[PDB]
Amino acid sequence: MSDHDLKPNAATRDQLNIIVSYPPTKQLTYEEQDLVWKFRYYLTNQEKALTKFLKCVNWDLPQEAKQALELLGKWKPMDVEDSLELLSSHYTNPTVRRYAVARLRQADDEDLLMYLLQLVQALKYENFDDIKNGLLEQDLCTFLISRACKNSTLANYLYWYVIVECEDQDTQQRDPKTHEMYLNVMRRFSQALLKGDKSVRVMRSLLAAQQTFVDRLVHLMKAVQRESGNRKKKNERLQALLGDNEKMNLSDVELIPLPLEPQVKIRGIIPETATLFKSALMPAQLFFKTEDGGKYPVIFKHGDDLRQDQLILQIISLMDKLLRKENLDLKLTPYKVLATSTKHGFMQFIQSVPVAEVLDTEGSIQNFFRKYAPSENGPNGISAEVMDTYVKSCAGYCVITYILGVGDRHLDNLLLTKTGKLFHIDFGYILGRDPKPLPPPMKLNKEMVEGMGGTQSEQYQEFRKQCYTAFLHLRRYSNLILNLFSLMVDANIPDIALEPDKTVKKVQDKFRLDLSDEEAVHYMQSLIDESVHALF
Template identity: 45%
Template sequence: MDTYTFATSRQIDFPVCVKINTLEGKQTTTPHTVLLKHPEIRHVGSVQNPHSELYVTAQLWAESKPLGVSMQTPHLFFKNNRTWNKWMELPVQIKDCPISSQIAITIWDISPCPETGSLDHAIPFGGTTISLFGKDGALRKGRQKCKVYRREAADGHSPTRTPHVPRPKRRKPNEPPPPIIAEEVELERLEQLFKKHEMNEIPQNDWLDQLVFQNVGKKAREVEEAARQRSSACKLPKRRAPITNGSNGQAIQDDESSSGSESDDEERFTLYIDFPRWDFPVIFEDFGYEPSRLMKEFSSNLSGSVLSPKPQPEVRYGPGIAAGTTVVDDEEYPIVQIFDPEQFQRENPCESKHRRLVRSDRNAFSDSDQKPNAKMRDELNEILSYGPTQELSAQDKDVIWTFRRHLSREKRALTKLVKATDFSNPNEARQLVELIPRWAKIDVDAALELLGPTYDNPVVRAYAVDRLRQAGDAELQLYLLQLVQALKFEKYEQTEEGLPSASLAKFLIDRAANNFILGNYLHWFLMVECVDQGTDTNAMNRRLFSRVEYYFMLELEKRNPDLRKILLRQGELITIISSISKDIRFSRTNRLQKIEMLKKTLADPKNDLLKIDPPIPLPLDPEVEICGVYPDEANVFKSSLSPLYLNFRVASAAEGSSASTQRSQTHGKYPIIFKTGDDLRQDQLVIQIITLMNNLLLKENLDLKLTPYRILATSPAAGAVQFIPSTPISAISTKYKGSVLAYLRANNPDVSGPLGVRKETMDTYIRSCAGYCVITYILGVGDRHLDNLLLQPSGHFFHIDFGFILGRDPKPFAPLIKLCKEMVEGLGGTASPQYAQFKQYCFTAYTTLRKSSSLVLNLFSLMVQSSVTDIRLMEEQMGMFGGAVGKVRERFNLDVSEEEAVRALDQVLADSVNAVFGVVIDRLHEFVQGWRA
């Protein structure tokens, strides 16, 4: 089949044109009695001569308003028929015409007797109105047949009184439908074929076409005559419509005369017109206006109770409103959409009134002892099972509020009650404040939800901060990145001295001042936000973070000045490394020269990097103290940003250091990668979530051998990454001919082990593959290729480079999980018992993480106003809780049961294994990287 092609009206930079062809019809003779009574009528052109000179005007209308001036045909002398064959160009471009555009065409007659001395001698002979676009939105083209309404000027209003195709008349309730005349149906079919013939859609044959035209014309006259006879036989005599003189249409013909003459309906005139013909259909396309400033402001400031904008209201014009005093049929009411700025800020007044009545003081005593019945308990349990991002309906809020005292023993219900409370009502706010101290103690993940952007009540936030005090320093470190972002939602007087004792900022400062590990990360998280000058940040937030950092430094000066000096020394270290990294990056030398330049700079005593005395905690990992750097082991990676490889000399490590820290320390060394020109905050967030998920899995005794290496953004355009000795899958594939299994056998041979690999190594590989497949699926990590999939000799598999998350991917048709054939080959293929065990680990990890989905969603909700690239993009596109949080919630599949969620994950794994396009992308990536090298 040929490709169906069309154009849009916005592409047609061409004026609206219409060709006036021929007027056909039989005009009745004016009776002599009328001429005797009104002798001036005999001088009207059409009364004197059935082929008198007429002229035509055409004007474009839309929404009952004229578009431009009317255009007119010249005066012509007709002999046998009224044929103009004149094109008229209207002063409006097709691209500027709305969908409701219609052309009002009026045929004007000449009267020598102007009314009240007017110089206008034109009276309407008849008029018709035709829409510019058809019902399907396509621009009309070719020959058109228009009914002419005698003695009426064309009506350009919506709906028009002079449509070119008459509307079917309404029947009375018991009136039978009009009979179907076979000849008229056949004639309509032939007219459609003639139109296709004119458009060259039907092959032409000149001698045969002439015969057909003659016979069809003869048949058309017979059908018209038969219709006229049936009309005369079936209808009662009508009064003839009066002839008017002047443009105002004042009647000058006697209505009582010629009561027995032919009706006006018998004067059937048809005007044939032409529209330009186009090679392809032209479809209407509306103009995309930018949203108004109010719309942008209200969309960006949606309250937390509104997860998605309400549909815009529809307004219908009533009878007599659409066009003057015209009564419009029900099915023809035009619908217009209006923008209501209050729909994003104010709720339905009826619902508000209902809520006030339900929650009024007169019901307060009855609510105090009210207990739900069995049916209501089921409804309450369903509401309490809602996720943190699910919206409560008005009925849900009323149910929660009614049984609020009964629910005070249920810790899950507090966040739902806060959502159900109308804080604009002082009575409701007071009752909530009285209930909170008596409520069952909530968990830390629920407390994180109360610190989000939708909760601004100071008592509620103070209670959430108080519940955070039950978390240990290690747990608090897992949430610290989000808690720093939650400082943006704090509301207190900035002029008061110090920080409120119940504020989140005061709590973080107190805990960080007592634990240097927390203090180290809090300091660097704040410093990055203080110097962020990005387009999506504002000065108010920078002042806020600077104020918190200032009070943190004051607190350290009071409690332990040595810790403050350590942070200052860390800042000097990062400043020196950043300066060296910039010089290397912008140096116009080759890579080998950059490496020599780096080694020489590190060995220079002026930079104080060769020996650091006394040792200081590494900002990336404060559990490790460094006392210098190894200049000879420094390197510059092959990349456009020229990242630096630095190997620090370790002085000591704290007891209880993390597994990743212990693995990274090889013979007293700690290697890192330092980047300049790249914002690492998104990678830092992903690693933090991976670390959190690893802890959640370990609590369930599920060790998936993950490698949550450390990342620290030291500024919006620089940062450090912990270096884990490993090999990319691409290099393994090249060296071992695409076999990961051969790599594992070479490093951990065991003839008695599974697939010839040591059992512990194969188990580590299976577990780590499953863990990263599930976590990268939940986080929507994209841009996966063989260069950012790494494998250690011990079997630890892990991902790096998280530049695309939340479902974003620069490659088309990317699978939801990166499970390439090299990874599957390392498991022994899809039919091996190792692959079955891999799938089982995936299902177990997925179901385990789904149980803690509220914690993950709450952490992402605290990041909705952060400068993380992909989160910011999602929030701009979809709004609060519809962007980043919505994407993560979608991957958890919380709307279905656990069994259905596991089946969905199984299908995703199967699709990823069989994805052909991913293999093509990997090969293309290898080719591009090889060409660059």
């Protein structure tokens, strides 16, 4: 007469195995909850089942909620990436949210960093009183802060991710409680760092030091941008001022972490080699003096919101690392991007050449490779390593921009390196938006297929094959990827703010989870064949 030892038959066991493996974004029917609830003790052996079970529980009712939080403790503990589900707007039970935090605590700092941007958004769903009242024992805020005190990379990204939230005037107006919460989070972090040992107090003073550097760099740009005179006068000015260390302190400073890549430490900016891009917004190329004695080049952008690119480069970075986990290195170029404000930011410079220019100067991608990487014995005269790099990186981006639905793909946004690496910059249109109407679902391009040697080449087949493999690997992390996007729904990211209600679905649909590995591999093939046909 008792529930503990229930055993479903094979038929209800397959009904349960479908339900368990639904994406996190699928609401269960009333009948489905009843089955999950009915066989709850049987499902405690399946860590994947826990997330579906918490969705069955009606938290208004005190009695089974009580039995829910009981089973939670009994349940085989869930994987880290499923705990990102419990942190969304969709859960408010304190015990659940805490169990979530408890599970994240099992991720190592490397993994944690991959999710930090999204975690800082999750704060919007924590309890604002508990957060302020600080002037299964940790809420998210305590956990995040506690990890920053011990990890200086986490502390940097947590510092910058959170002040960019403080400095968001938009939020000040429309959602003042969420703006105080982020001020309270910045306060909570400073306070925690102050109670630390001397090394932790130094790490804090180094945060301030960077903020100061970036404050002064902003001041420099305003001086430059507002001085009538052509690019050459503006450039002459930029260098005058960088050069003047007593004035601006941007030439020589006491070693500090680069906000763009904190592991890298810097002494200043080489005054003479700094210029402004011909671009309308006149951003700056800045060569940082690294500690070792080398130099890290950068783009500094003023009067321009990088938060949308910040997200995309971090999903691209995640995806690269996911694919790399399964031993598939598609030679992607996930360049770094950090917003320093809603109005400015750094961005990692990568020596490259836009395909628009390659064509103009060399005539074709292959001419370019033949010129800088020739090989008597190579495919089409080109080093097989360069060509291998190109094929891989083409297939990589292709799958990735297909999923994130990146629009506006002209030949000044595709960039090419002399080692064969192809990558995308500039993600002002994502999730299906485009400046032209009826955009193709697949962003291919003639001169790209011709770089491969043409639709007859064996490189072109290898390209197609790498695309399948990439598609299928990325599909296996649909849970993760979607959970993370879910935490991004209420964010000042123009392309997500246009339709917060529908953002996650637009990524999910690209995964074709209704299809299976066989059919998925076949649907891709189709897309690639249709796109290539349509180009000719």
